[PDB]
């Protein structure tokens, strides 16, 4: 009840990779597909298996309390999963985004927050 | 009237690649050419998720001034200089030394 953490993130990730709808979620989404590329959707299996396995390299303390993660721990994780530290930093970034988002879902309404979602365009020119 | 063209095999006169031979990929307007296996640079690429581009140090081929590359004579095994004549009614290239057409 403290808030959103890597435990709930883990649950949502395993439920994700089990229920993964990339082909279906591409259909479920309409306004985002008109702007962003159609084939830009990443494969769920590889990415989410990588994420699950990398999370599995983490102790229970680094999960419930994600802000104690540092470089040496990233080394342990990367060496454990047999991958690059930049990927660990990548997944920590994605987890930061997810945490921020879910925090915004918890603070406001799901309808105000679902309608507050915006598609960023740096100009009216497409892809520029 | 352009001397060095796509797909010519050339030899490199100048630079760290002096003496090396290779095949031309393309030419650029500024008088620069890009040659196979020639003038590799190590470039750093910020990973791009839209193009699924990983990060890392990519070895790439950097343009070389066309004055520095010579058209490679396969007959003589030497670098050559090129000239133009009219055979048939068509404008054609030849090697200066053995004066044979290309």
């Amino acid at each position: 009840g403290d808030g959103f953490d890597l435990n709930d993130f883990l649950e949502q990730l395993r439920q994700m990779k089990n229920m993964g709808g990339x082909x279906x979620x591409x259909x479920x989404x309409x306004x985002x597909x008109x702007x962003x590329x159609x084939x830009x959707x990443x494969x769920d299996d590889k990415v989410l298996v990588r994420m699950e396995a990398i999370i599995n390299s983490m102790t229970m303390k680094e999960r419930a309390k994600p802000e104690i993660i540092k470089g040496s721990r990233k080394r342990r994780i990367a060496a454990g999963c047999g991958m690059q530290v930049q990927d660990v930093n990548r997944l920590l970034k994605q987890f930061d985004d997810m945490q921020r988002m879910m925090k915004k879902m918890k603070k406001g309404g799901x309808x105000x927050x679902x309608x507050x979602x915006x598609x960023x365009x740096x100009x009216x020119x497409x892809x520029x | 009237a352009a001397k060095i063209r796509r797909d010519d095999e050339v030899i490199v006169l100048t630079g760290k690649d002096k003496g090396k031979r290779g095949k031309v990929k393309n030419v650029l307007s500024s008088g620069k050419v890009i040659v196979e296996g020639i003038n590799l640079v190590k470039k750093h690429q910020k990973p791009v998720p839209a193009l699924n581009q990983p990060g890392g140090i990519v070895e790439k081929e950097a343009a070389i001034q066309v004055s520095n590359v010579a058209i490679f004579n396969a007959a003589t095994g030497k670098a050559d200089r090129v000239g133009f004549r009219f055979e048939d009614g068509k404008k054609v290239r030849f090697f200066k030394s053995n004066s044979e057409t290309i």
Binding site: Q15, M16, X36, X40, X42, X110 | -
Partner: peptide, 23 residues
């Protein structure tokens, strides 16, 4: 109407975060 609405709404919060990572 309400079916597809509620259905998609349940998982609605999980999708765009992964979609943003894909984009």
């Amino acid at each position: 109407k309400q079916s597809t609405l509620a259905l998609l709404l349940l998982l609605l919060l999980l999708t765009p975060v992964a979609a943003a990572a894909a984009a």
